[PDB]
Ligand binder design. Structure first.
Ligand SMILES: O=C(O)c1ccccc1-c1cccnc1
Ligand SMILES: [Fe+3]
Ligand SMILES: [Fe+3]
Length: 298
């Protein structure tokens, strides 16, 4: 489809997709000798993303920033493995996201999930300690002056998770939105909600994002770049899909169903898209957690 760019390589004059479209790392060209990365992928893609990076970046000491939307294992798994190969990089993440990397228990969960995704006999490169990452915490509303023609605003966007932020390039009307709008359904063209921490926060983040100057390019955590009407309408559509799921939950409960019934149906209808980077137990359990959240707050 012409409104979804979903191939590795160049996406715009300044922007490339590295790795797999399902868990991509974006590469911004900031100048002749300066680059940034956006989103932090899954650990097992280290050599793939590194190889792709080196096709565009002849000297990786020119990689100066790495912007991170949130602490989930599929959005920061590359950091310890590519860190050592990027001697000038500064990781830019929220305060709560940075805090997660200082927690032994939180780090354990991330490492276990990423290691479930290794192909057999696959060995990972030498890793920085999670608590030694070259991180700089960024605040809600902060302007990241990345280069002469790259200025991105941090916007708090809690709900999917309690640390989540998005990054807005107003010059290009371009929003890196992480998972805050949900998972874009490639077959049907609609947003699937991903409410895994707080429904009220998730919806209020979408209300605020809807107020941004009209979007031209919308870049979520999975699936590529959305443009045209999909970008312009994305936040509003994500919000109305979340409400649709609430009504659906209420309708079935009112017929005496357990949360497990709609959970299995959502896993069946939606779990196939992420099967290659998400353990299926996690998808089904995530569907259950989401319905538990919607059921409590509705
Ligand atoms: O956030 C996602 O990308 C996602 C999408 C569908 C199902 C589960 C997750 C998820 C849940 C928890 C931590 N990581 C990922
Ligand atoms: Fe997530
Ligand atoms: Fe994700």
């Amino acid at each position: 489809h012409m409104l979804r760019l979903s191939a590795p390589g160049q996406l715009d004059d300044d922007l490339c997709l590295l790795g797999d479209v399902q868990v991509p790392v974006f590469l911004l060209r900031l100048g002749e000798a300066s680059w940034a990365l956006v989103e932090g992928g899954i650990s097992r893609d280290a050599e793939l993303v590194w190889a792709d990076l080196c096709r565009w970046v002849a000297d990786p000491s020119q990689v100066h920033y790495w912007l991170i939307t949130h602490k989930h294992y599929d959005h920061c798994g590359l950091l310890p493995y590519l860190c050592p190969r990027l001697p000038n990089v500064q990781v830019l993440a929220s305060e709560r996201t940075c805090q997660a990397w200082k927690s032994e228990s939180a780090v354990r969960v991330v490492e276990r999930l990423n290691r479930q995704l290794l192909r057999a006999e696959q060995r990972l490169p030498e890793a920085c300690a999670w608590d030694a990452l070259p991180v700089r915490a960024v605040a809600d509303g902060e302007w990241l002056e990345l280069g002469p023609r790259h200025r991105l605003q941090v916007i708090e966007a809690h709900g999917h998770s309690d640390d989540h932020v998005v990054f807005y390039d107003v010059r290009r009307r371009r929003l890196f939105c992480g998972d805050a709008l949900g998972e874009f359904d490639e077959a049907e063209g609609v947003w699937r909600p991903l409410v895994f921490d707080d429904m009220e926060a998730y919806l209020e983040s979408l209300e605020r994002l809807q107020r941004l100057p009209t979007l031209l390019q919308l870049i979520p955590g999975h699936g590529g770049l959305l443009r045209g009407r999909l970008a312009a309408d994305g936040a509003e559509s994500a919000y109305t899909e979340c409400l649709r799921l609430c009504r659906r939950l209420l309708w079935r409960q009112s017929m005496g169903e357990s949360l497990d019934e709609l959970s299995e149906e959502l896993h069946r209808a939606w779990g196939g898209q992420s099967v290659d980077f998400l353990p299926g137990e996690l998808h089904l359990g995530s569907m259950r957690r989401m319905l538990e959240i919607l059921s409590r707050q509705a």
